[PDB]
Amino acid sequence: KVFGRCELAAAMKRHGLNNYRGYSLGDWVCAAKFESNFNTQATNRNTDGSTDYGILQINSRWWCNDGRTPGSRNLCNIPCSALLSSDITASVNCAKKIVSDGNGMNAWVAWRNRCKGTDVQAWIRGCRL
């Protein structure tokens, strides 16, 4: 499913992401925008052979099991396919573990490179939340 900006912001809010670990809803929406373009079915393979899954592009080497990444840690205890669902619950629960991991949202290269230090509030502007 390809989420709309405000539609996604409200779903994340409901799932307790706004201000989770101090990151605003704007940060999370901006990150999903540049990570997957709001598409839950997005996947991208990396050179190390691992693959990124879903709206937040969660990596298979550490967080999920896709059965084809040697030495996967599967820290979120879920098959990577669950991350491509139209319901964002699994992606959100896993993202919560990642963001608490110590490096915060810097774990997401698109957030670091395109959201960090920007007017992220613009991403939820106009939304009835």
Swiss-Prot record:
One Gene Ontology term of the molecular function aspect: lysozyme activity
Keywords for the protein's UniProt record, in alphabetical order: Allergen, Antimicrobial, Bacteriolytic enzyme, Disulfide bond, Glycosidase, Hydrolase, Secreted, Signal
Known role: Lysozymes have primarily a bacteriolytic function; those in tissues and body fluids are associated with the monocyte-macrophage system and enhance the activity of immunoagents. Has bacteriolytic activity against M.luteus.
Main location: secreted
Keyword Signal: yes
Subunit-structure text: Monomer.
Protein species of origin: Gallus gallus (Chicken)
Gene Ontology cellular component annotations, sorted alphabetically: cytoplasm; endoplasmic reticulum; extracellular space
Note: Lysozyme C is capable of both hydrolysis and transglycosylation; it also shows a slight esterase activity. It acts rapidly on both peptide-substituted and unsubstituted peptidoglycan, and slowly on chitin oligosaccharides.
Subcellular location: Secreted
Binding site for substrate: D101
Tissue specificity of this protein: In the egg white and polymorphonuclear leukocytes.
Biological processes, Gene Ontology terms: cell wall macromolecule catabolic process; defense response to bacterium; defense response to Gram-negative bacterium; defense response to Gram-positive bacterium; killing of cells of another organism
Catalytic reactions of this protein: Hydrolysis of (1->4)-beta-linkages between N-acetylmuramic acid and N-acetyl-D-glucosamine residues in a peptidoglycan and between N-acetyl-D-glucosamine residues in chitodextrins
Family statement: Belongs to the glycosyl hydrolase 22 family.
Gene that this polypeptide is encoded by: LYZ
Disulfide links within the chain: C6-C127, C30-C115, C64-C80, C76-C94
UniProt protein name: Lysozyme C
CDD domains noted in UniProt: LYZ_C
Active-site residues from the entry: E35, D52
Pfam families documented for this protein: Lys
Protein EC: 3.2.1.17
Domain C-type lysozyme: 1-129
